[PDB]
Amino acid sequence: AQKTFTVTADSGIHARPATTLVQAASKFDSDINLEFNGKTVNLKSIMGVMSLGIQKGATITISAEGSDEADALAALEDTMSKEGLGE
Amino acid sequence: AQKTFTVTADSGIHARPATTLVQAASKFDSDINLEFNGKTVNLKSIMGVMSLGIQKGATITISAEGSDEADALAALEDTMSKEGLGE
Amino acid sequence: KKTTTVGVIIPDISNIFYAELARGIEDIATMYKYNIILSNSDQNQDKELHLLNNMLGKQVDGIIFMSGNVTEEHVEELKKSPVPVVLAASIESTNQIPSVTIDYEQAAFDAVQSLIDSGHKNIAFVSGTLEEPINHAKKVKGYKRALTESGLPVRDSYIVEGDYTYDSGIEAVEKLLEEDEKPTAIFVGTDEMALGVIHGAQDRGLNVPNDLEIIGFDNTRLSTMVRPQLTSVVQPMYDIGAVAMRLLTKYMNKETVDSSIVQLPHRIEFRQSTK
Amino acid sequence: KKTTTVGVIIPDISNIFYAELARGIEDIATMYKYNIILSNSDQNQDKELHLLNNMLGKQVDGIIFMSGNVTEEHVEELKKSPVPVVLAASIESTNQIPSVTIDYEQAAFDAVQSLIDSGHKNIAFVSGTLEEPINHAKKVKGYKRALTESGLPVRDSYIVEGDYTYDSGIEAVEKLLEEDEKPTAIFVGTDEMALGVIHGAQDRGLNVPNDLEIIGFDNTRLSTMVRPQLTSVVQPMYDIGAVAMRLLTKYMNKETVDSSIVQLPHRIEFRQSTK
């Protein structure tokens, strides 16, 4: 149903690194989401991510839900760590 | 029939400062020209100027010729010195 | 009718700030398949006001406009505009036109006060264009408010405003430090008018944060290539691009827009011009 | 038919280099009334090769393309292209496609040898991407030729190639200076991989040109905001824009083109990383 992460990229999740995941997340077929400090927006959206201002530090949480969850949690885990993000 | 100048702008005649005069010079009605080290191209052209690679140092020469010379030699003298160019 | 092409009128894309702003725009307007018709504004009321018209003539389903001062009238032609306009990293009182940008008052404020607790007495401001409602009504605003609110002489000449250059960033630190009463610290908008200031006092012999505790704005790459590295305000030049278009897009693709006026997050990135 | 709109495919306009290149383009394509359809290339053979097609589909009377490596095939679709293409600050063997850029071999060469007379023994190269025919076949070319031609060990490992960052510009100066035989000097392409190098050795305690005599490329504003200020190769990022379009324009407005392949002037701008 998901994972959990600790943002490692010192320029958080902004720049393309941002337009990067909104991307992957765009793909799939599940009800992805980003869980950062209480708050949490579908990951399949840009604003929401960008709006949460997710710097280098915190614990983040992936949120996969629907016929192709698992696959995302993995195209993505593999995705952000690939791009110097959480881990 | 013209003037003569000594390029003061340390980034010669490049950047907009370049696309700047090719401009004025564009206007007029005379056979303007830029005289830099032997060589000399109509000033009413970009390439020619840019091609002459006119850095910060040398003596340059305006070249006005035709029913509205004088006016240029002046819209221009007033032009480049206005833009940190020759003097 | 709708051409799948969104113009944009940005000042000078030679400017790094505005640069990363394209990417901002370019990069989403692609995800959402619209060719962006870039067009340099060179900050000038006719260069602006005209150039627009065309975005409109050469039919473009929207326009993310930018200025360092989106003027009274400006809005009018803007309110008028038959196509959606979404002011980016620019500002104008009325909220009448959507507008994605960062919180320019408070950000100014924070560093100022977050200088003062660094055991700080006599602070200072060095911003550019005191005209731009983006400055005088904002970064000074905050520069001042956190300042007053913690009883301090808001010395109307502790603030000088060179353009947006490095050269002037040093040249301001000079004329400000010519003064009798020397500053325990300094604020600055232009990210590079920070280097303008660090290698600024550092040139008349003065260590940082040793002699002066500096800070600034943007955090853009330029905030690393210096010794000390520069401690400054974080604003997402790109991110503003991003959420700008996504927003115009939301308007161009009749989607339900939440807030017509946004302000993405901002934090402090202390490198070394602060202890 | 002809739409008065010229696409352009540039890598990343976050990049200052490419930035001032817009202005280059933008600024003339305006004088000569053509809306430029910017479009980020992100250096990738499909990102390139595709993106083009469209410039073409959404009919645009020409295309000033850019890459750090305009590839074999690339030319083919390019030679094919029903619209005029004018490679800018990019290069490909054949001259088959007009191409405005600066003289990349010799420029490389000059600084190298104009280091050597500075009473110079063991020199060095620090460029990025040794793939880009813009590097390995050019700036090294010259780095090497002026080097050999004045009998010197062309030490195939006196050259390391980080990307185009400051961080790597310091990180290369390290792994190059880990070596037994230490360099009386250093060359570098990326204008900011110069700062990467100055505040590079300057961080492991080493004065410039005191300990090392450095130089580099572009001369772009970044070549002032450093202490020492950086002594480097002058290339007109904008000027390439300028004479690029003027040239496409000359092709789009059936004018008689002189040389299909140009190389605007280049000089040395010694600030301080050289004595």
Side-chain angles (χ1 to χ4, degrees):
Chain A
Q2 72 186 41
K3 191 86 275 191
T4 277
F5 277 67
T6 72
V7 60
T8 84
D10 24 318
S11 43
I13 321 170
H14 308 258
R16 294 155 70 183
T19 309
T20 253
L21 272 58
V22 203
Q23 250 53 176
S26 270
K27 298 272 176 166
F28 286 65
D29 226 353
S30 314
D31 286 53
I32 312 146
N33 259 269
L34 166 66
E35 230 267 50
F36 164 100
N37 176 58
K39 316 172 187 284
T40 301
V41 204
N42 88 91
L43 225 212
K44 306 150 288 158
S45 172
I46 192 95
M47 301 187 137
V49 164
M50 319 235 77
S51 69
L52 290 146
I54 302 64
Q55 52 164 160
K56 167 197 166 180
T59 15
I60 12 174
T61 353
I62 330 161
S63 306
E65 299 289 313
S67 102
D68 129 299
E69 320 175 9
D71 320 59
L73 172 41
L76 295 165
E77 277 180 318
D78 232 76
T79 229
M80 83 195 285
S81 53
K82 214 90 174 186
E83 313 261 58
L85 282 77
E87 197 256 23
Chain B
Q2 72 186 41
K3 191 86 275 191
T4 277
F5 277 67
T6 72
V7 60
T8 84
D10 24 318
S11 43
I13 321 170
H14 308 258
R16 294 155 70 183
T19 309
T20 253
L21 272 58
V22 203
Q23 250 53 176
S26 270
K27 298 272 176 166
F28 286 65
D29 226 353
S30 314
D31 286 53
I32 312 146
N33 259 269
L34 166 66
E35 230 267 50
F36 164 100
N37 176 58
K39 316 172 187 284
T40 301
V41 204
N42 88 91
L43 225 212
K44 306 150 288 158
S45 172
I46 192 95
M47 301 187 137
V49 164
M50 319 235 77
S51 69
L52 290 146
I54 302 64
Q55 52 164 160
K56 167 197 166 180
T59 15
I60 12 174
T61 353
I62 330 161
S63 306
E65 299 289 313
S67 102
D68 129 299
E69 320 175 9
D71 320 59
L73 172 41
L76 295 165
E77 277 180 318
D78 232 76
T79 229
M80 83 195 285
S81 53
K82 214 90 174 186
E83 313 261 58
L85 282 77
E87 197 256 23
Chain C
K1 202 54 283 167
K2 320 121 200 311
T3 45
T4 84
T5 325
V6 241
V8 0
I9 263 176
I10 186 170
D12 173 55
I13 21 60
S14 306
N15 201 299
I16 46 101
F17 170 168
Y18 299 109
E20 285 197 320
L21 245 163
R23 197 75 262 195
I25 323 274
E26 164 53 19
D27 288 24
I28 266 3
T30 307
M31 197 184 150
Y32 299 178
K33 58 130 279 189
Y34 283 33
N35 301 163
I36 40 94
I37 285 325
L38 172 81
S39 209
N40 274 303
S41 154
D42 269 356
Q43 305 242 13
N44 181 336
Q45 190 147 323
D46 311 285
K47 298 261 75 303
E48 315 200 282
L49 269 309
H50 172 60
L51 259 175
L52 220 156
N53 282 27
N54 303 48
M55 246 67 237
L56 322 173
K58 193 76 69 75
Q59 300 188 53
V60 315
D61 323 327
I63 297 165
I64 309 189
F65 169 90
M66 287 168 83
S67 160
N69 191 152
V70 172
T71 282
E72 299 102 354
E73 170 216 270
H74 289 55
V75 188
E76 196 201 68
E77 277 72 341
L78 269 190
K79 282 168 63 170
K80 273 50 284 177
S81 269
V83 271
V85 186
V86 72
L87 294 244
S90 301
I91 99 169
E92 71 84 7
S93 50
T94 65
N95 271 45
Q96 299 254 149
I97 37 60
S99 187
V100 170
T101 67
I102 219 298
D103 186 9
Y104 301 79
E105 209 289 35
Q106 250 284 166
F109 172 126
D110 303 287
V112 213
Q113 164 61 278
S114 210
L115 236 187
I116 284 173
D117 326 310
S118 193
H120 263 331
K121 42 185 289 283
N122 318 353
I123 272 58
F125 206 5
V126 176
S127 69
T129 305
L130 276 202
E131 224 155 347
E132 285 171 1
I134 205 302
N135 268 267
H136 104 264
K138 254 61 190 298
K139 268 101 96 243
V140 187
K141 255 296 181 306
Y143 162 56
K144 271 171 177 173
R145 181 198 22 156
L147 190 55
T148 92
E149 166 194 291
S150 172
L152 291 130
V154 178
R155 282 160 272 189
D156 74 356
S157 74
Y158 231 23
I159 63 154
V160 43
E161 117 285 303
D163 24 289
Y164 290 143
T165 43
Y166 166 66
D167 211 299
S168 57
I170 295 183
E171 183 182 278
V173 205
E174 237 169 274
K175 192 201 273 80
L176 198 154
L177 253 184
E178 254 164 3
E179 163 127 82
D180 293 292
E181 292 302 50
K182 272 75 170 209
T184 39
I186 297 197
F187 199 43
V188 227
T190 319
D191 198 57
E192 101 186 307
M193 282 209 292
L195 287 31
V197 180
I198 291 282
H199 311 179
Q202 304 176 312
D203 263 88
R204 279 212 298 177
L206 297 92
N207 317 321
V208 193
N210 312 291
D211 309 9
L212 323 175
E213 294 246 80
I214 282 41
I215 296 189
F217 233 127
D218 301 295
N219 173 44
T220 74
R221 292 196 40 164
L222 304 129
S223 199
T224 64
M225 300 176 238
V226 293
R227 230 101 298 172
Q229 285 190 325
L230 178 264
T231 287
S232 169
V233 180
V234 157
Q235 178 183 198
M237 300 320 130
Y238 175 118
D239 281 14
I240 286 187
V243 183
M245 178 80 54
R246 175 74 201 90
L247 197 58
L248 179 46
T249 21
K250 289 200 180 179
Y251 268 96
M252 311 191 274
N253 305 179
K254 304 198 176 196
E255 288 184 59
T256 333
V257 184
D258 192 83
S259 295
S260 185
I261 74 297
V262 199
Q263 301 187 296
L264 321 174
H266 75 271
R267 104 291 209 95
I268 261 190
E269 257 316 319
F270 345 55
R271 261 119 195 58
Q272 327 289 19
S273 69
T274 218
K275 93 86 172 89
Chain D
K1 202 54 283 167
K2 320 121 200 311
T3 45
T4 84
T5 325
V6 241
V8 0
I9 263 176
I10 186 170
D12 173 55
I13 21 60
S14 306
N15 201 299
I16 46 101
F17 170 168
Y18 299 109
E20 285 197 320
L21 245 163
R23 197 75 262 195
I25 323 274
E26 164 53 19
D27 288 24
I28 266 3
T30 307
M31 197 184 150
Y32 299 178
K33 58 130 279 189
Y34 283 33
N35 301 163
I36 40 94
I37 285 325
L38 172 81
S39 209
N40 274 303
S41 154
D42 269 356
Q43 305 242 13
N44 181 336
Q45 190 147 323
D46 311 285
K47 298 261 75 303
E48 315 200 282
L49 269 309
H50 172 60
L51 259 175
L52 220 156
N53 282 27
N54 303 48
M55 246 67 237
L56 322 173
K58 193 76 69 75
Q59 300 188 53
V60 315
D61 323 327
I63 297 165
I64 309 189
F65 169 90
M66 287 168 83
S67 160
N69 191 152
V70 172
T71 282
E72 299 102 354
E73 170 216 270
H74 289 55
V75 188
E76 196 201 68
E77 277 72 341
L78 269 190
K79 282 168 63 170
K80 273 50 284 177
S81 269
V83 271
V85 186
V86 72
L87 294 244
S90 301
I91 99 169
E92 71 84 7
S93 50
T94 65
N95 271 45
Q96 299 254 149
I97 37 60
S99 187
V100 170
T101 67
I102 219 298
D103 186 9
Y104 301 79
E105 209 289 35
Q106 250 284 166
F109 172 126
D110 303 287
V112 213
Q113 164 61 278
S114 210
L115 236 187
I116 284 173
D117 326 310
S118 193
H120 263 331
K121 42 185 289 283
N122 318 353
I123 272 58
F125 206 5
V126 176
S127 69
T129 305
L130 276 202
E131 224 155 347
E132 285 171 1
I134 205 302
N135 268 267
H136 104 264
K138 254 61 190 298
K139 268 101 96 243
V140 187
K141 255 296 181 306
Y143 162 56
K144 271 171 177 173
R145 181 198 22 156
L147 190 55
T148 92
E149 166 194 291
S150 172
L152 291 130
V154 178
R155 282 160 272 189
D156 74 356
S157 74
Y158 231 23
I159 63 154
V160 43
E161 117 285 303
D163 24 289
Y164 290 143
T165 43
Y166 166 66
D167 211 299
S168 57
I170 295 183
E171 183 182 278
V173 205
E174 237 169 274
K175 192 201 273 80
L176 198 154
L177 253 184
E178 254 164 3
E179 163 127 82
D180 293 292
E181 292 302 50
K182 272 75 170 209
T184 39
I186 297 197
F187 199 43
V188 227
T190 319
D191 198 57
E192 101 186 307
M193 282 209 292
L195 287 31
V197 180
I198 291 282
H199 311 179
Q202 304 176 312
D203 263 88
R204 279 212 298 177
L206 297 92
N207 317 321
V208 193
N210 312 291
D211 309 9
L212 323 175
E213 294 246 80
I214 282 41
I215 296 189
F217 233 127
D218 301 295
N219 173 44
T220 74
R221 292 196 40 164
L222 304 129
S223 199
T224 64
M225 300 176 238
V226 293
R227 230 101 298 172
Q229 285 190 325
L230 178 264
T231 287
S232 169
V233 180
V234 157
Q235 178 183 198
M237 300 320 130
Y238 175 118
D239 281 14
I240 286 187
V243 183
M245 178 80 54
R246 175 74 201 90
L247 197 58
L248 179 46
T249 21
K250 289 200 180 179
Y251 268 96
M252 311 191 274
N253 305 179
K254 304 198 176 196
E255 288 184 59
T256 333
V257 184
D258 192 83
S259 295
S260 185
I261 74 297
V262 199
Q263 301 187 296
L264 321 174
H266 75 271
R267 104 291 209 95
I268 261 190
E269 257 316 319
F270 345 55
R271 261 119 195 58
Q272 327 289 19
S273 69
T274 218
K275 93 86 172 89

